C-alpha cells in the first residue's frame, strides 16, 4: 500500500553527482593510464559489474586506489563515469569503440547493448 | 548530443538498496531512541537536508555514529530510510503524524508536502 515519488531516484542521482563535482565523501581514486578519477565506491558498484566484484572483495574493499587495465582509454572511462552519475551517455562516432570496450571491461550491460546497436546501424 | 538511459537512476537506487540490505559499505549508524539503523552517508545526504548539513561539516563528516533528537520516533525514521533507498513511502493513518514530524526534522521537503496533503484530505 506504499505511494511512490516518481522523481526520487533521479533527484538522488543528481545530488550524488553534486557531491562528486565538489569532491564530497569520495572514497576511491580510479587510475586509468596515469589519469585519476575520484568517485564514490557505492555508485561505482551500483553501475558496474566489475566495481561490484572489486569492492565486495574482503581485501580490495579497503583500497583507496584502483588501477585499471592499461588498455583502458581514459576518455572512454570519463564518459562512462559521467553516465554512472547522470544516466547521460556522450556517445560519438569518434569515441564509440573506446566507450564499448570500456563498458565491456566495466560490465555495464546496457551501455554495451546501445554501442552494439549504434555500430550495427553504421555498417 | 547525449543519449539517456531512462531506467538508470532507478537501477542505481535498487542496487544501493541491495548493498544496504547486505550491509555492504555502510559507513554510519543512525541512533533513534536506542534503535540503530545502518546506512550510506552519501544516500542520507542525497535525500535529506539535515544529513547533507551534518556530513558536509568538517568534524561530523568523520563520525561513524549519529544520534537523532530523542523526540524522533524509530518507526517514522525506518519508514523514511526505506523511502530514501526505494522511492516508496509506507504512509498510513497510524504513522502519518510521526512520518511528517520525522520528515520535517530530516528536511525531506517532498515527503512533508505529501503528508500535509494527506492530512488536509482527512479533516
Amino acid at each position: 500500500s506504499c505511494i511512490q515519488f516518481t522523481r526520487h531516484a533521479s533527484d538522488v542521482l543528481l545530488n550524488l553527482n553534486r557531491l562528486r563535482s565538489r569532491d564530497i565523501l569520495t572514497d576511491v581514486v580510479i587510475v586509468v593510464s596515469r589519469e585519476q578519477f575520484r568517485a564514490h565506491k557505492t555508485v561505482l558498484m551500483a553501475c558496474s559489474g566489475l566495481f561490484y566484484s572489486i569492492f565486495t572483495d574482503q581485501l580490495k574493499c579497503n583500497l583507496s586506489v584502483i588501477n585499471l587495465d592499461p588498455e583502458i582509454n581514459p576518455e572512454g572511462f570519463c564518459i562512462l563515469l559521467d553516465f554512472m552519475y547522470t544516466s547521460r551517455l556522450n556517445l560519438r562516432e569518434g569515441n564509440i569503440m573506446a566507450v564499448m570496450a570500456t563498458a565491456m571491461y566495466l560490465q555495464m550491460e546496457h551501455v554495451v547493448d546501445t554501442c552494439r546497436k549504434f555500430i550495427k546501424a553504421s555498417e | 548530443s547525449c543519449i539517456q538511459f531512462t531506467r538508470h537512476a532507478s537501477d542505481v537506487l535498487l542496487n544501493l538498496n541491495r548493498l544496504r540490505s547486505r550491509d555492504i559499505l555502510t559507513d554510519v549508524v543512525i541512533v533513534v531512541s536506542r534503535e540503530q539503523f545502518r546506512a550510506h552517508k552519501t544516500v542520507l545526504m542525497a535525500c535529506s537536508g539535515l544529513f547533507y548539513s551534518i556530513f558536509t561539516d568538517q568534524l561530523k563528516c568523520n563520525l561513524s555514529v549519529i544520534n537523532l533528537d530523542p523526540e524522533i520516533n524509530p518507526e517514522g525514521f525506518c519508514i523514511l530510510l526505506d523511502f530514501m533507498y526505494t522511492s516508496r513511502l509506507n504512509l498510513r493513518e497510524g504513522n502519518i503524524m510521526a512520518v511528517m514530524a520525522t520528515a520535517m526534522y530530516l528536511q525531506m521537503e517532498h515527503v512533508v508536502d505529501t503528508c500535509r496533503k494527506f492530512i488536509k484530505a482527512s479533516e
Partner: peptide
C-alpha cells in the same frame, strides 16, 4: 506521487 503515484500508486506504484
Amino acid at each position: 506521487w503515484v500508486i506504484p
